[PDB]
Design a binder for this molecule. Structure first.
Ligand SMILES: CC(C)N(c1ccc(Oc2ccccc2)cc1C(=O)O)C(=O)[C@H]1CC[C@H](C)CC1
Ligand SMILES: [Mg+2]
Length: 559
């Protein structure tokens, strides 16, 4: 069937949409070519709609069924709990889209009589009505990028706040613990960036002759079929579940996840969906399970040998035992055909990679640098173009989510996050006298509130003290960063070094936590290095819930 059907009504915005970067005195010091920076708007929605709309092809074989049963057996060990309204509400982000039933984010978290009473009625309804298609709103997502030698906005389909709270009640526990139980070490969201690298590097070394590749599925969400979603429900159903939760999953599956009507911001019937919705609680879990299933089965059809998968939603990377250049290329092609039959055709054709640093998964790649002692140290990085374009935009305008803070946390050891983002933002935060202020950001889709002053500890716990001393990066990483700077018009190292030394001095004079950031974060900038000993606060940090599972589109907030 058709991934989508359209009525003609347009996907409309719900206010004014900024497309260009504001000429700002502060954004200009970070990036000079402001015209290369842009944000998607509903004005490009038509272009997107045509790309995600198509008839899906699907043929299932014995390999698929086999892997499916393997997966179900493991799911069979699971015991999901079911959250009470109270907890599900606690999980709602303070700034999440309001409900059309008289209440909003704040009321939900505050457990207002009106919000809880409505939520209750939606839950009862999910228990009584097993059919009626649940209404969703479709919107053009606004995201920032740098022009290329432009991207049309992405679309998001999400149900009402009321319905979202119920999804949590019935599936929060499931989507937080079933992926790991079913896929084990292949589930990428259980790893912190450093743990992801270690898993990738060790996996790579465990091969006599390693061969690896990333697989890009062309619009993965639209390739998800009604069948894949029921197969996915079948996996969830192997769990021990409270009666009400079992019915909630059954009804939410037929009424929401397999598809339903599309309404715009004006309240107009836009069309219908018969593929994955991007703004539902099961999206990450669902996509990860389905990609792993098709991929694993695809590997068997292709005869790839000793495959180790690493899956994060629709993002996939496979590392296996080489069989030779020609044989690897043939196997890879066979893999792609198997995936195509399973309704997961490629966007970018896949290519075998014999160099670990050249494999990009989760928009990132593993690379290597050196610590003070001089020992090689592997770490996660990525092309900084987008991270930087967005740092510029968030500098010029107020945004709910600060990706820059999220990028500093996840890529702390990188040459670009240290030299550019830390310097730029600590300089700016000192000025505005807002170093104490907590900011929201996302990690694997879950929303968190973090104090910039804590970055030193956070970085030590997740990356180790070496994140403050890495130097001598790879020639490949250096060219990528440098050619990035030229493109966006970012000041060179010298300028940044001067700024960092000036910010570092200012941070050291304040003492307390600010001096902590001064000493650690900017030690790369001075010549007279300061001995960097373990930060006490790093040994008393609970950062486990940070890397448990994916939540993108889940409307998840970790208090
Ligand atoms: C060796 C030495 C001088 N050096 C480098 C300076 C420039 C560079 O590569 C470029 C080139 C152009 C633009 C940006 C970086 C790479 C390195 C390195 O450590 O290998 C450093 O000490 C870095 C160490 C990390 C900080 C955070 C910035 C300076
Ligand atoms: Mg893709």
């Amino acid at each position: 069937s058709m991934s989508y059907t359209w009525t003609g009504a347009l996907i409309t915005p719900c206010a004014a949409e900024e497309s260009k970067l504001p000429i700002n005195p502060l954004s200009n010091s970070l990036l000079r070519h402001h015209n290369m920076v842009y944000a998607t708007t509903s004005r490009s929605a038509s272009l997107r709609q045509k790309k995600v709309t198509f008839d899906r092809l699907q043929v299932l074989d014995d390999h698929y069924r086999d892997v499916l049963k393997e997966m179900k057996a493991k799911a069979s060990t699971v015991k999901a709990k079911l959250l009470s309204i109270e907890e599900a509400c606690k999980l709602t982000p303070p700034h999440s889209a309001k409900s059309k039933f008289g209440y909003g984010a704040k009321d939900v978290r505050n457990l207002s009589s009106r919000a809880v009473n409505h939520i209750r009625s939606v839950w009862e309804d999910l228990l009584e009505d097993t059919e009626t298609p649940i209404d969703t709103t479709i919107m053009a997502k606004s995201e920032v990028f740098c022009v290329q030698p432009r991207k049309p906005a992405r679309l998001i389909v999400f149900p009402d706040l009321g319905v979202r709270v119920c999804e949590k009640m019935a599936l929060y526990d499931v989507v937080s613990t079933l992926p790991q139980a079913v896929m084990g070490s292949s589930y990428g969201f259980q790893y912190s960036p450093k743990q992801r690298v270690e898993f990738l590097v060790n996996t790579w070394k465990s091969k006599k002759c390693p061969m690896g590749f990333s697989y890009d599925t062309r619009c993965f969400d639209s390739t998800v079929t009604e069948s894949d979603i029921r197969v996915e429900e079948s996996i969830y159903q192997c769990c021990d579940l409270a009666p009400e939760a079992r019915q909630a999953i059954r009804s939410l599956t037929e009424r929401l996840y397999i598809g339903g009507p599309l309404t715009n911001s004006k309240g107009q019937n836009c069309g219908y969906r018969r593929c994955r919705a991007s703004g539902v609680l099961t999206t990450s879990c669902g996509n990860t399970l389905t990609c792993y299933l098709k991929a694993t089965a695809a590997c068997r059809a292709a005869k790839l040998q000793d495959c180790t998968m690493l899956v994060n939603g629709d993002d996939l990377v496979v590392i296996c035992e080489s069989a030779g250049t020609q044989e690897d290329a043939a196997a890879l092609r066979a893999f792609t055909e198997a995936m195509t039959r399973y309704s997961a055709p490629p966007g970018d054709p896949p290519q075998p990679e014999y160099d670990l640093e050249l494999i990009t998964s989760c928009s990132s790649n593993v690379s290597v640098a050196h610590d003070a002692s001089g020992k090689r140290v592997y770490y996660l990085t990525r092309d900084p173009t987008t991270p930087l374009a967005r740092a510029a935009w968030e500098t010029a305008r107020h945004t709910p989510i600060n990706s820059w803070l999220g990028n500093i946390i996840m890529y702390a050891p990188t040459l670009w996050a240290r030299m550019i983002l830390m310097t730029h933002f600590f300089s700016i935060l000192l000025a505005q006298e807002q170093l104490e202020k907590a900011l929201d950001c996302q990690i694997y889709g879950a929303c968190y509130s973090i104090e910039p002053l804590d970055l030193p500890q956070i970085i030590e716990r997740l990356h180790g003290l070496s994140a403050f001393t890495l130097h001598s990066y790879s020639p490949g990483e250096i060219n990528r960063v440098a050619s990035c700077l030229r493109k966006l018009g970012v000041p060179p190292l010298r300028t940044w070094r001067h700024r960092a030394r000036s910010v570092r001095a200012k941070l050291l004079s304040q003492g307390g936590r600010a001096a902590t950031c001064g000493r650690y974060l900017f030690n790369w900038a001075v010549r007279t290095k300061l001995k960097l000993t373990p930060i006490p606060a790093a040994s008393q940090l609970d950062l486990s819930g940070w890397f448990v599972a994916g939540y993108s589109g889940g409307d998840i907030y970790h208090s």
